[PDB]
Write a protein that binds this ligand. Structure first.
Ligand SMILES: CNc1nc2c(CCNC[C@H]3CC[C@H](C#Cc4cccnc4)CC3)c3nc(N)[nH]c(=O)c3cc2[nH]1
Ligand SMILES: CNc1nc2c(CCNC[C@H]3CC[C@H](C#Cc4cccnc4)CC3)c3nc(N)[nH]c(=O)c3cc2[nH]1
Ligand SMILES: [Zn+2]
Ligand SMILES: [Zn+2]
Lengths: 347, 347
């Protein structure tokens, strides 16, 4: 495989479906990346069986424990945790130099972990005034150039990994445009939309995506960081987003929240205590094949680890099934119909 | 298969190896029964993959949550938890009537759960005076007859399950003999040695097994309740024990203790932080195939659920491998050699 190739196979409006090819494997887009040096309560083989093509790791947590250098001594993150496919690492979400973490150190840590997709080191709270959002965006663009240069100066990294830049600008169209321009001038393998899902609400997030995603190079992947709920994902794909990561399915799962095509349910609710149905009626996951709502209700009420395991496997599988229906519906020119049907039933 | 058939295929001194056949499957003896309505941190398929033929469930915990009647409404324990092979249930470890639980209720609960091997309801703290141990043993034998009659009066249970009686008597040879006599006069499908592993220490436990196990019918299985460490198991098999249950491998596992052929290790110890070796050098389990001491050290230090999962899978697999080496060495007439070699290396 090449270091990085993104190809778009089908479109419908702003939505796209395709593939990213990398040395460690192929990523089907739109993609959901489960968040990890573990996807909580799941073996990597289980994560793969749900359909994930790539997972996310964190520069912040891993650098603290067990340490980036230690992981590199041990053979890198893939070998450490037993996941042999692509890994995307966030950059580590104050001075011009960095945070006491700088762009250079961030890129180095991601190298030491052996990340396949490296994120530029970026700085913007919500709400923000125009002045503050601009100051922050500009710093982020200076740090984006430092990230680019640090990555390129490390031959092994530049030859085997990819680098994504992150658009800032808060909710302001002019700053988003400046930011997109800056990032394209530097040039990256993909472009994230940063600075959303930080308290603005779906309506506002969608409004900003509406003008922001078209500013980015059309021929490169578009990653919406930290999103989100199933309906956030569907709307964001309608606006041109190709990649997602979020802790909801894992975290939610351990707290009793199961995703279903008829909306989320809280399995701890006494109404499930004698419910022999699977979590979701249509889900093809191993959990829905084998165990009832009643059993999983019991496990979660009892604080049993197997409850966390089963809830998490189901939720990540649900999310992968969602992404597959999105991909197929775009490939078949019926994604707008799918999005409408999905929302009518989910809500 | 028959309701219950125990056949001995080979012997060496007091040690025996063979099979129990039941409707839900065959049990290889000497057997280790992992303790559960879940074996903590493991899917039942994982439990089976380690080599377990039977697991234990509890009348006490299940009757409290989620309730015996609820589990029967839901189709019984096997269907509830997704384990289709035999399950042994303890009886629920004060008046002549029972505990505020009586023999009759205990047997009924085990029926409602759908237990394959039902334990008689029994009462003896350590240390105990001869007078108190005798009083307690005698009550237990009256309760053993009540258990027998309750089981036999329920046709479905008597036709499809087995009933084991439990020997008491503390550390006193004469009371153990009276107890064995009483139980044989009533007649059971198997015989447990109760009242050990309650604080007496290995030397004393072995001394009591030395005279107590020969008192029991030779042609029926002998179950040592709540034992134990790998060396306890080996010594107890040398004294005629066929069946074991213990929470050590599961509980220990979650606390960082891994069993190995060179003795237990605590994986949280900083010495393992960069150790790329598997938990045990010879172990054939999936955990030792795939992950390092270093990774598992990190997970347990970090309190990650996957740490508990992997430690537990390894430890239960270790125990099953131990039981297989015992079975094979008895079948080959070299168990005394095995026991000596095991101890020399383990210690
Ligand atoms: C929960 N919402 C959210 N998460 C964000 C992250 C982390 C992505 N997940 C790890 C971000 N990381 C970065 N680096 N930048 C963001 O703007 C950024 C923005 C985010 N918004
Ligand atoms: C930990 N040691 C130990 N556990 C015992 C149990 C429970 C077996 N595991 C469930 C027992 N259950 C019973 N019923 N009787 C015992 O004497 C009895 C004795 C035990 N000794
Ligand atoms: Zn499911
Ligand atoms: Zn192992």
């Amino acid at each position: 495989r090449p270091r990085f190739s993104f190809s778009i196979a089908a479109r419908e409006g702003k939505a796209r479906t395709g593939t990213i090819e990398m040395k460690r494997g192929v990523i089907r887009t739109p993609a959901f990346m489960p968040v990890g040096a573990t996807v909580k309560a799941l073996k990597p083989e289980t994560v793969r069986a749900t359909g994930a093509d790539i997972i996310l790791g964190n520069t912040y947590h891993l650098m603290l424990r067990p340490g980036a250098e230690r992981i590199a001594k041990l053979g890198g993150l893939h070998s450490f945790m037993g996941w042999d496919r692509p890994i995307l690492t966030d950059s580590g979400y104050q001075s011009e130099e960095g945070v006491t973490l700088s762009p250079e150190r961030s890129i180095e840590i991601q190298h030491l972990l052996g990340s396949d997709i490296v994120m530029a080191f970026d700085e913007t709270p919500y709400p923000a005034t125009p002045s503050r959002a601009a100051s922050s965006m500009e710093r982020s663009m200076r740090w984006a150039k430092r990230s680019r240069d640090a990555f390129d100066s490390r031959k092994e990294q530049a030859e085997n990994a990819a680098l994504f830049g992150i658009q800032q600008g808060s909710v302001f169209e002019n700053l988003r445009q400046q930011s997109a321009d800056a990032l394209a001038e530097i040039g990256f393998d993909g472009y994230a939309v940063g600075g959303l899902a930080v308290g603005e609400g779906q309506d506002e997030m969608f409004r900003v995506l509406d003008f922001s995603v078209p500013m980015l190079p059309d021929d490169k992947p578009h990653y919406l960081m930290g999103v989100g709920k199933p309906d956030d994902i569907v709307g964001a794909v309608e606006r041109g987003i190709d990649m997602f990561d979020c802790v909801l399915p894992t975290r939610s799962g351990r707290n009793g929240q199961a995703f279903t095509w008829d909306g989320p349910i809280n399995i701890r609710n006494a109404r499930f205590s004698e419910d022999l149905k699977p979590l979701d009626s249509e889900c093809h996951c191993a959990v829905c094949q084998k165990w009832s709502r009643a059993y999983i209700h019991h496990l979660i009420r009892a604080g049993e680890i197997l409850g966390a395991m089963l809830m998490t496997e189901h939720n990540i599988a649900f999310y992968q099934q969602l992404m597959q229906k999105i991909r197929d519906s775009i490939s078949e020119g019926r994604f707008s119909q799918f999005a409408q049907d999905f929302r009518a039933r989910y809500f």
